[PDB]
Amino acid sequence: MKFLQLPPRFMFFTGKGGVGKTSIACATSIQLANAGKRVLLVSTNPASNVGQVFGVDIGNRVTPIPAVPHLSALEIDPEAAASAYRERLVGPVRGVLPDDVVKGIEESLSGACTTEIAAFDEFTALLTNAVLTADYQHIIFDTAPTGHTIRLLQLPGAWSGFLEAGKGDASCLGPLAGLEKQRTQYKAAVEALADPLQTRLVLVARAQQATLREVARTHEELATIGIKQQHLVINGILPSAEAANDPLAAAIHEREQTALKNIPATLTSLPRDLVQLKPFNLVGLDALRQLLTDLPLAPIELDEPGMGDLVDGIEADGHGLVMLMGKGGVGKTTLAAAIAVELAHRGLPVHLTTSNPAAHLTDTLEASLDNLTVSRIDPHAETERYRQHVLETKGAQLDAEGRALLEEDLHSPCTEEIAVFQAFSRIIREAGKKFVVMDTAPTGHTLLLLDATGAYHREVRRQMGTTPMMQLRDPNQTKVLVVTLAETTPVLEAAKLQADLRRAGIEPWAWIINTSVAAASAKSPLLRQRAANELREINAVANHHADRYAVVPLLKEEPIGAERLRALIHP
Ligand SMILES: Nc1ncnc2c1ncn2[C@@H]1O[C@H](COP(=O)(O)OP(=O)(O)OP(=O)(O)O)[C@@H](O)[C@H]1O
Ligand SMILES: Nc1ncnc2c1ncn2[C@@H]1O[C@H](COP(=O)(O)OP(=O)(O)OP(=O)(O)O)[C@@H](O)[C@H]1O
Numbered sequence: 115m116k117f118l119q120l121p122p123r124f125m126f127f128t129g130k131g132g133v134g135k136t137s138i139a140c141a142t143s144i145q146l147a148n149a150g151k152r153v154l155l156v157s158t159n160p161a162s163n164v165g166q167v168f169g170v171d172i173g174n175r176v177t178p179i180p181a182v183p184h185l186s187a188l189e190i191d192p193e194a195a196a197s198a199y200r201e202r203l204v205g206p207v208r209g210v211l212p213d214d215v216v217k218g219i220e221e222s223l224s225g226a227c228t229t230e231i232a233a234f235d236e237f238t239a240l241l242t243n244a245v246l247t248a249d250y251q252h253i254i255f256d257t258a259p260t261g262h263t264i265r266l267l268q269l270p271g272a273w274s275g276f277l278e279a280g281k282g283d284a285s286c287l288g289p290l291a292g293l294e295k296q297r298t299q300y301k302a303a304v305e306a307l308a309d310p311l312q313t314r315l316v317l318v319a320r321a322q323q324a325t326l327r328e329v330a331r332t333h334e335e336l337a338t339i340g341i342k343q344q345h346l347v348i349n350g351i352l353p354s355a356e357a358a359n360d361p362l363a364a365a366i367h368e369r370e371q372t373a374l375k376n377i378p379a380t381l382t383s384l385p386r387d388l389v390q391l392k393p394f395n396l397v398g399l400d401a402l403r404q405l406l407t408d409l410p411l412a413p414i415e416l417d418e419p420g421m422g423d424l425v426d427g428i429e430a431d432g433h434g435l436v437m438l439m440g441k442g443g444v445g446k447t448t449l450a451a452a453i454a455v456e457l458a459h460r461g462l463p464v465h466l467t468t469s470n471p472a473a474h475l476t477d478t479l480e481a482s483l484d485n486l487t488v489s490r491i492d493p494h495a496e497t498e499r500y501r502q503h504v505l506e507t508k509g510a511q512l513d514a515e516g517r518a519l520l521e522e523d524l525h526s527p528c529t530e531e532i533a534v535f536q537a538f539s540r541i542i543r544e545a546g547k548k549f550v551v552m553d554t555a556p557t558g559h560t561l562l563l564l565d566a567t568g569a570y571h572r573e574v575r576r577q578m579g580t581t582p583m584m585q586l587r588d589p590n591q592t593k594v595l596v597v598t599l600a601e602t603t604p605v606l607e608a609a610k611l612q613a614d615l616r617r618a619g620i621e622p623w624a625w626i627i628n629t630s631v632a633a634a635s636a637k638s639p640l641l642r643q644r645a646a647n648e649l650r651e652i653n654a655v656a657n658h659h660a661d662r663y664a665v666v667p668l669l670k671e672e673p674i675g676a677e678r679l680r681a682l683i684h685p
């Protein structure tokens with residue numbers, strides 16, 4: 115593998131959701147550790163659990179993997195990190211200050227900005243601090259889908275620019291934030307990210323035109339940030355030997371070949387590695403030890419409920435919010451577009467929204483349909499809207515110097531997040547009179563947006579003197595659908611997401627097993643084995659996790675445009 119050639123200390127595996135960042139990161143960490151190196155594997159995705167991949171109980175603590183000598187694993191928990199940050203800020207004054215003052219200080223640290231900054235501080239401590247990672251020769255970061263990862267990697271530069279501009283009064287974080295003591299650390303992080311001899315950035319993609327376009331956009335953004343000498347890894351490439359004697363495999367292979375040949379002109383120069391599709395789920399060392407090397411090398415008739423029944427059930431309501439959630443890459447955007455176009459074709463007023471920052475619905479819907487309002491949440495426009503709204507609502511009474519200080523405070527990088535939340539809330543407020551199909555951002559970001567803990571609400575009311583959850587908790591006006599894949603890790607992640615939703619009072623309305631190879635009768639031996647492995651996950655979802663569910667096959671033609679999207683609802 116090209117990226118496994120004189121690797122630097124740090125290696126970032128970025129890309130669109132579901133492309134194989136975690137699988138490839140685990141495989142490379144295993145390969146490096148087995149070579150005699152001291153490797154640490156950091157997982158920056160809140161919604162994923164590398165313990166299921168490795169079979170060990172990896173947690174926030176740096177836990178060695180017994181199966182692989184010299185390999186250790188770590189998971190950055192935003193909530194645990196926030197609790198540790200709050201404790202280290204509040205403990206010195208426990209008893210010293212009056213209990214009322216302690217309660218007030220704890221109140222000031224309950225906002226979502228503190229939750230963001232704690233995780234960011236842990237990330238930059240892993241990047242820069244030397245004592246913290248002294249006994250590791252390599253640190254492999256496995257990031258969340260690109261939508262959140264680009265913001266994570268932009269945060270170092272944004273915070274460094276905010277601090278070095280002389281505007282250190284990030285009143286959102288509180289008077290005890292003490293951002294200045296991290297001023298150098300953040301700066302160091304930037305210098306660590308933009309140095310090709312310290313960090314290697316690997317963009318993981320799949321042989322699909324939409325994925326390749328999004329990866330090209332991500333590469334443009336990262337190059338703008340300052341990261342140089344990136345590598346590219348195309349994963350899930352169906353072997354060319356399976357195309358024979360299987361029309362489905364032949365169509366998939368032809369589509370992947372065309373996507374590779376039509377790669378965006380920007381990515382044609384990056385050193386490119388190719389990872390094939392394997393007949394087994396990449397769980398455990400036995401399956402992860404043979405991911406980066408090619409395998410030497412009647413169909414199942416599946417009859418499961420379709421998605422037309424779910425769309426009929428949604429339409430029977432006549433209005434409300436349909437929120438699509440799940441693991442990255444499961445097909446949330448495709449299914450959102452399909453539901454929206456089907457409802458629009460049924461003569462209903464539909465509003466299709468995308469909460470993902472790095473979103474482009476044109477990859478799916480390239481037409482201008484009728485009875486369909488397609489929109490997206492632009493973080494920059496929303497940030498400017500929120501900034502102006504706060505300035506006029508709260509800055510009117512403040513004097514000129516007060517208004518200037520408020521403007522400096524509103525320019526902190528955390529503001530965008532709360533701005534996005536506001537936008538999200540506003541959108542959710544229009545679902546009572548028309549269908550609102552919301553394709554959500556990565557699972558962790560969306561779960562924070564739901565604001566079950568009230569952090570975002572506290573922050574926005576602090577900056578500005580019915581919450582979304584009060585509406586999501588009400589089945590009469592919302593329908594949360596969990597999109598999964600008929601695979602081990604996707605199903606476990608969906609089960610954990612469902613548990614998180616139920617803990618907050620939200621009961622998912624249905625499950626959608628997307629791109630199931632079992633449903634699409636496949637004759638090639640590889641696809642036969644994949645379907646055989648998918649049967650158990652389908653049974654687990656049907657009998658255990660989901661009471662109402664739908665199964666969508668693996669379409670031979672990638673679903674793009676109104677015709678194909680409406681066809682996967684009526685197969
Ligand atoms: N049934 C299907 N058959 C074939 N390809 C599919 C199917 N469903 C989705 N895809 C393809 O899966 C790719 C990734 O799915 P998609 O972008 O819709 O998922 P997502 O949940 O929005 O992902 P992410 O969280 O990474 O943004 C898309 O290119 C889409 O073409
Ligand atoms: N080369 C491959 N061959 C077969 N299956 C693969 C391959 N790469 C990934 N997968 C499957 O992809 C599924 C999702 O991949 P994975 O969890 O590695 O993605 P990710 O990029 O970490 O996802 P997320 O964005 O949600 O964090 C896993 O079930 C794994 O089985």
Ligand SMILES: [As]
Nearest residue numbers: 227286528529
């Ligand atoms: As803030």
Ligand SMILES: [Mg+2]
Nearest residue numbers: 135136159162
């Ligand atoms: Mg992952």
Ligand SMILES: [Mg+2]
Nearest residue numbers: 446447470553
């Ligand atoms: Mg999406």
